[PDB]
A paper describes a structure:
Streptococcus pneumoniae Neuraminidase A (NanA) is a multi-domain protein anchored to the bacterial surface. Upstream of the catalytic domain of NanA is a domain that conforms to the sialic acid-recognising CBM40 family of the CAZY (carbohydrate-active enzymes) database. This domain has been identified to play a critical role in allowing the bacterium to promote adhesion and invasion of human brain microvascular endothelial cells, and hence may play a key role in promoting bacterial meningitis. Here we describe the crystal structure of the S. pneumoniae NanA CBM40 domain, hereafter named SpCBM.
Crystal structures of SpCBM, complexed with α2,3-sialyllactose (Neu5Ac-α2,3-Gal-β1,4-Glc, from here on referred to as 3’SL) and α2,6-sialyllactose (Neu5Ac-α2,6-Gal-β1,4-Glc, from here on referred to as 6’SL) are also described. For the complexed structures, both 3’SL and 6’SL were co-crystallized with SpCBM. There are no significant conformational changes between the apo SpCBM structure and the complexed structure, and superimposition of the apo and holo structures gives an RMSD of 0.48 Å over all Cα atoms for both 3’SL and 6’SL. In the 3’SL and 6’SL complexes, the protein structures are highly similar, giving an RMSD of 0.06 Å for all of the Cα atoms while the sialic acid moieties of the ligands are completely superimposable. The lactose moieties of the 3’SL and 6’SL, however, point in opposite directions. In 6’SL, glucose O6 interacts with the side chain of Asp180. The carboxylate group of Neu5Ac forms a bidentate interaction with Arg274, a common feature in proteins that bind sialic acid. Other Neu5Ac atoms make additional interactions with SpCBM: O4 interacts with the side chain of Glu195 as does the N5 of the acetamido group; the O10 carbonyl oxygen of the acetamido group interacts with Asn209; the glycerol O8 hydroxyl oxygen interacts with the imidazole nitrogen of Trp280. Phe167 provides a hydrophobic platform supporting the glycerol carbons (C7 to C9) that are ~4 Å away, and also forms part of the hydrophobic pocket accommodating the acetamido methyl group. A striking feature of the protein is a deep, negatively charged cavity adjacent to the sialic acid binding site. This pocket is formed by four residues (Glu195, Gln203, Asn207 and Asn209), and is occupied by a lysine from a symmetry-related molecule.
Numbering used by the authors: 118 to 305
Amino acid sequence: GAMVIEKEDVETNASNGQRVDLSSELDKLKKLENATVHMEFKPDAKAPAFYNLFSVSSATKKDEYFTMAVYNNTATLEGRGSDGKQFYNNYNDAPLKVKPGQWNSVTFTVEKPTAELPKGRVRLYVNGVLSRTSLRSGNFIKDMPDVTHVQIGATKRANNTVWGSNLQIRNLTVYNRALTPEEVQKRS
Ligand SMILES: CC(=O)N[C@H]1[C@H]([C@H](O)[C@H](O)CO)O[C@@](OC[C@H]2O[C@@H](O[C@H]3[C@H](O)[C@@H](O)[C@H](O)O[C@@H]3CO)[C@H](O)[C@@H](O)[C@H]2O)(C(=O)O)C[C@@H]1O
């Protein structure tokens, strides 16, 4: 199949600066056009207001990054290129929330633009259920020329590190195609 990254049973905590570095997998991410990023995780119960689940970021460009994040329990998503402009529509007020202190999954899919999807397609699902679809772009890591770092948890944006939290991560899986809603229902 389509699996290009799988990381199991890792965690972010004080001892690792609330971060699991995956930056060695950056070239695999840059190559993707259609993609899925899936995480199954358990946040500590009284979570920070904003915390990153999976991000790609830059040592030189503070505002160029991709993040799947949680904001006041809402599963959210943002990608910004070398001009700092948004790749996707706002997800901060997307309808689906995670339950901290328990197991949850969040799945992001991206489809590059095609004849029938002229601006591409991005979806975020929470616990197998579509939260929001965004048809602004199908931009992804291939569209971020200055990225250097990949991580679960605390995210290095140039000379600052932000969005850390304590997470148990049963798995992070990245695929080289966009799973369908039906696959997200069964494969989560
Ligand atoms: C998904 C999401 O909400 N992303 C926003 C992000 C997060 O809410 C926070 O990081 C969570 O803690 O906040 C961002 O804004 C915070 C930073 O703004 C920077 O200044 C901006 C300024 O506010 C802009 O209006 C201006 O046009 O450009 C400046 C340079 O970036 C500050 O310099 C920085 O210290 C923070 O205050 C973020 O970038 O983190 C915006 C995300 O969209």
